[PDB]
Amino acid sequence: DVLMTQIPLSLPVSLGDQASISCRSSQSIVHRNGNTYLEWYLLKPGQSPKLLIYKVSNRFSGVPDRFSGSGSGTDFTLKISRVEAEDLGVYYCFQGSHVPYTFGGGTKLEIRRADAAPTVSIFPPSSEQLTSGGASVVCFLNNFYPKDINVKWKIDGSERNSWTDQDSKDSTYSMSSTLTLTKDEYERHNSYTCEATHKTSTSPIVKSFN
């Protein structure tokens, strides 16, 4: 099989800068008919793959002209000039010359923006869930950068997670932390605390509820 090696694994880039992704095949991908069926696809979060480039260097209809492809034989490059926030996601090269057709490992393009402190919110169990017989306290940490963040759950002072992809609008991250416990254990405590420690602020961002 033709192995497609993609570099880099992760590509952080500031808005307006250029970006380059490389793809190297373990053997030539020149078809018998003389064509090189090397394609580039973009997988945006929650969407089906999108064709960007076909036959090494040909831009697919509707693709912005800031995308370009080049290369030959075994070495190929996807170039993005003046990166925009809508460009984030996972880029794949693909060879369609030799069966079995094979994809590269993927490159996750991430937008590098200014550091942003998360907006923290805490939510008690609703009435309906309480009737059911469980108790979930929900904490949203929305619109922060960069992705790394710490969350701590404390019940009455004593200690006790889902990450979104990067947002295509403002290049921020969001995270949800859900503390699940029994209704009986929930009824016998008072204060519930969700602490958010981020690279932005020195002091933790605490949100509690009675």
Added chain:
Amino acid sequence: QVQLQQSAAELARPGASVKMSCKASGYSFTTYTIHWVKQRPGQGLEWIGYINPSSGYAAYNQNFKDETTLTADPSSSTAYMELNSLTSEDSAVYYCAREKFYGYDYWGQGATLTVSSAKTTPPSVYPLAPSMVTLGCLVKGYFPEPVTVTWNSGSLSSGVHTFPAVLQSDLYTLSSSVTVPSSTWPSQTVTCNVAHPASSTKVDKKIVPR
């Protein structure tokens, strides 16, 4: 209007078979080949095979040929992928895509296959209520993936953050949030709409101010 319509979610038992469909419309079905691509969380994209509806020829990735059969019915413009001898390793999102001249230009929406003996369980949908105000709904205790969430039947799209599901005790839990201006809620009603295709269930939860 070229469209490849799949089905969002299939659940199948270990050792059984499943036959997934890709209904093409908007073009001459026999003139393009239909390919199948597998996306398993930690394995990139994998090409499964293609079927040429004009000739009837199906080409297979030899790694899956003993568990895969591709067919096409021109009279209904539908391509099919049948997987046999299913294992948990086969759980993944599967796409169909058409191609002829410029690679994979149109793609199906993807079909999430889960291989498990567990029963289908619809989610419980709970409202999450408290300048800018964040609301949400908690989609708890469902199986299998996926669920889709909109707000106000899709009319409320800006300011939404839907979080990936977490698996605990063999059930999935997801949360979605929407941030709104205070002057509109609860004057203008806000409803979270949840769909669980595997159980064919839809739930509309109004977020009451209390």
